[model samples]
Target: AMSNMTYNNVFDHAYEMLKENIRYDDIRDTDDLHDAIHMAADNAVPHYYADIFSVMASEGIDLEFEDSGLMPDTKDVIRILQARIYEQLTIDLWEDAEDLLNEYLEEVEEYEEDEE
Candidate 1:
């Protein structure tokens, strides 16, 4: 019980730091970007694969999502993310997808919150 309390304390501190820079494209480092991606928006879902991957361009990371077998038929690193949700988006485009991701995360987190 005591150990869990300390863990929650550190979780809050790190989450504050992460939340501050969560949407920013230029993460402190690659691992930091993935870290932010994983923890994006303080939820349990893989929230914001599209939003976070879009930052890869600004962070100057290159990926062939299809070649990596993560997603297929998409060449742009940013374009290929969130294909797990749908294949209609272009990897190089972030306009509408960002909004969609924002809403989806919103809904998902709403569901995650315990009911009254």
Candidate 2:
């Protein structure tokens, strides 16, 4: 029982540190960008790849989507991202897609709450 309590205390401290240190906008440098992308691909791959591949397969159905000559033909994801989401993407922004999605989700929730 005592050991379990100690472990819980340590975990709580670590989690609080993570929550306090997590600032999505502060990740700007290349090292931070790399870390962010690594985390996104590692942790959020399932979420992103589903959305990415669905669009890719749909776009591949049309020959015009091929005229751009981009590799993997996922350029529509980029176009949608550029036009519908952010107009431009930096290294930091590209790597922080998960964070941006979280922010967008929060905004949507707030709108729904206001509607309610």
Candidate 3:
């Protein structure tokens, strides 16, 4: 049961990342959080996906300091957590962004047909 940074951080670190940018004012709170997530998740998710692949391969080699059929106690729960992260990071994140984009497209139609 050796230690692993990869397993622990995807929760604690990003939770901190968003909550920090999130503030007290209700509107501003969500604004900051949205931007923070938007900024980070835009590019980070693809690389993070690559990172998971690397860990799977390299850690396969280690199997944690030689294949002893042992892993961190938290490994199973982290697998569940990994599922959620994938959901939120790309799937949910882009869902909102796409909605916003398409909604804005509609908003333009709502604009007065000026320059008439």
Name the best candidate (by TM-score): 3
* lDDT of candidate 3 at residue 56, scale 0 to 100: 42
The alpha-carbon root-mean-square deviation between model 2 and the true structure, to one decimal in Å, is 16.6
Q: Roughly what TM-score does model 2 have, to 2 decimal places?
A: 0.23
Worst 10 residues of 3 by lDDT: 59-68
Error of 1 at 111 (Å): 27
- Give the winner by lDDT: 3
- What TM-score fits each model? 0.22, 0.23, 0.30
Model 2 residue 115 CA deviation (Å) reads: 34
Per-residue lDDT over 1-116 for candidate 2, one digit per residue giving the tens place of the 0 to 100 score: 11112222322333333223334334434454444443332222212434434433432123232223323335455444322211111222343445644543454464543454
* Clash tally, candidates in order: 1, 0, 0
lDDT of 1 by residue, 1-116 (tens): 11112223323444454444444443434444454544432332123443444333232233333344545575653334443222212222222224433533454453434332
The lDDT values for all models are 0.37, 0.34, 0.39
State which candidate, 2 or 3, has the greater TM-score: 3
Model 2 lDDT-worst window of ten: 82-91
lDDT (10s digit) by residue, model 3, range 16-103: 4433333221222334346655543433322344555443433212222222222334546444333434444533443444343333
